[PDB]
Design a protein around this ligand. Structure first.
Ligand SMILES: O=c1[nH]cc(F)c(=O)[nH]1
Ligand SMILES: [Cl-]
Length: 224
């Protein structure tokens, strides 16, 4: 399939250099199913972050790998469907930092689509996972795809702030070395890393200050 059937057109053009790799991934995923190994999120959600316009991305959030529990991952990093409770621990931790930083009430639900509609790309370094097996698709080929995505964003040379959560930060910063790009890092919001530096990192206000510094408009982070 042409990438234009799977992703928004700006993203299809940006990712055309890795189109074969995306096709390779689809073959991998189908072979996993044939071998009895499922993946998450749903196939139609794998590339969901790339269905919001490439040309509108102002903030890139980059996590590690999708939630491994069935019913959680939706193809926007960290997000869940609006009916999901309890929220996953990483998301609950994100929302505590959100209230600490911004002073807003806790969100009504775990659905981050408003951020995606507002120019926040909710990416992961690796775009699939086998259920119950954290990080199990590492090294399977997503990395080249997400490197192309990140570099293509950087190459726009439009104001961009990248928020890097977790162990990929040192790998990803060189990909964001470009005019009008700034990368800020912390430990990941997961259960056993959040209290080692995620909390207190204030990414939402920081990203807005960095955007304004560059002459861009800040993100309205307010969730319903
Ligand atoms: O690194 C991540 N952890 C948890 C998630 F839900 C996600 O998308 N990314
Ligand atoms: Cl989690």
């Amino acid at each position: 399939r042409p990438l234009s059937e799977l992703v928004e057109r700006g993203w299809a053009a940006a990712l055309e250099p890795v189109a074969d790799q995306v096709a390779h991934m689809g073959q991998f995923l189908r072979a996993e199913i044939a071998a009895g190994r499922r993946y998450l999120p749903a196939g139609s959600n794998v590339l969901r972050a790339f269905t919001f316009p490439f040309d509108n991305v102002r903030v890139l959030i980059v996590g590690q790998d999708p939630y491994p529990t069935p019913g959680h991952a939706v193809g926007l990093s960290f997000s869940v469907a609006p009916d999901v409770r309890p929220w996953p621990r990483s998301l609950a931790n994100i929302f505590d930092e959100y209230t600490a930083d911004l002073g807003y009430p806790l969100p009504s639900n775990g659905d981050l689509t408003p951020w995606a509609q507002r120019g926040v790309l909710l990416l992961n370094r690796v775009l699939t996972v086998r259920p119950s097996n954290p990080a199990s698709h590492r090294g399977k080929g997503w990395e080249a795809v997400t490197e192309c995505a990140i570099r293509a964003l950087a190459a726009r040379a439009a104001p961009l702030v990248a928020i890097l959560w977790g162990r990929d930060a040192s790998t990803l910063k060189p990909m964001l070395a470009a005019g009008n790009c700034v990368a800020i890092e912390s430990p990941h919001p997961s259960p056993l890393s959040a209290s080692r530096g995620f909390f207190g990192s204030r990414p939402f206000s920081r990203a807005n200050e960095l955007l304004v510094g560059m002459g861009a408009e800040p993100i309205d982070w307010r969730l319903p």
